[PDB]
């Protein structure tokens, strides 16, 4: 059965500015099947108030989803996205790099 590995991007909606409201995004795309686990992490721990877009797919049938949460970037808080999927042998952690 067809399986495709999720591509993972972690980024903010607006250029990150310390102390200013924003949205933390984790965009997963190109995956199949649709069963996928995505968590946004703050200093290593799961963020509870995380929502996601409605499951859609691309011209090659592969799925995409946006996971997002409100946040205010600080000079020292660390953010990540943890993704699990059948195609991954272990959960994939991708750190947020503001700059870039």
């Amino acid at each position: 059965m067809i399986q495709r590995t999720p591509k993972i991007q972690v980024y903010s909606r607006h250029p990150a500015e310390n102390g200013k409201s924003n949205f933390l995004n984790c965009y997963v795309s190109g995956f199949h099947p649709s069963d996928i686990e995505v968590d946004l992490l703050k200093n290593g721990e799961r963020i509870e108030k995380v929502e996601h877009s409605d499951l859609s797919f691309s011209k090659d049938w592969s799925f995409y989803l946006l996971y997002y949460t409100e946040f205010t970037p600080t000079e020292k808080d660390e953010y990540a996205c943890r993704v699990n999927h059948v195609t991954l042998s272990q959960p994939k952690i991708v750190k947020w790099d503001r700059d870039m």
Partner: protein, 275 residues
Amino acid sequence: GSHSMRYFFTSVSRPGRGEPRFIAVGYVDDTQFVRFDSDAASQRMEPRAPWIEQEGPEYWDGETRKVKAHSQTHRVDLGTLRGYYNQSEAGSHTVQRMYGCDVGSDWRFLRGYHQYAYDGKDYIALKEDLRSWTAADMAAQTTKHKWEAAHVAEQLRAYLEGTCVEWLRRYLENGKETLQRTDAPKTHMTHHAVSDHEATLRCWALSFYPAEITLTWQRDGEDQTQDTELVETRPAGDGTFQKWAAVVVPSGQEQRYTCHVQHEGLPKPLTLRWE
């Protein structure tokens, strides 16, 4: 310019765990406006754009009724297809369905389409002429012939050339502030040192709409596509999109490189030079 309306249906079986998951979303161009989650509480089609929120009770009751019928059809298809391929009853399977229509700059019908997939690959598709079918495999044949005798193409053609384009046009009128807009990319370059002799140059495009965009790097004119890291265009979450392209450059050669940006919202293409 031209515009499209597309509906995306995904149905995923869940053996032993009750009925399949059914999710529906609708888009006009790059803007989502509809969405349905069989796991949601409402059990109703729901607005996902401001310009569709006040469509009225008839609209929502109607889309809800029809979308529920899509849910039941796909539930049966999951079983039918399972039977077509003699697959175990314990495994999860996926049906995907996409259909929609385009209108030209003049808003007259341009094209219609109806694609169907099982477990992530093509199963059966309506051909451009809207009268015939392309069947991917042996099992698709059974469905292809079934739809031929059931004159399914005719049903779809009537929808694609009628209701589909009629309401696409209505939506373009209702959400004209959103849908009939172009948001040019706000662009910029960043410079990061990789080593003492290398640097990352990253070219950003932010807050643009529609999603279509071209980001390319050149060195003295020569396109560096093979040496460019280009991420997929991504949603910012507010209806706009983001994209970047980066090259790793020998420190001291920054002036040789230019980032070129093309978007529908730009009067002319942009050329960014670190200088």
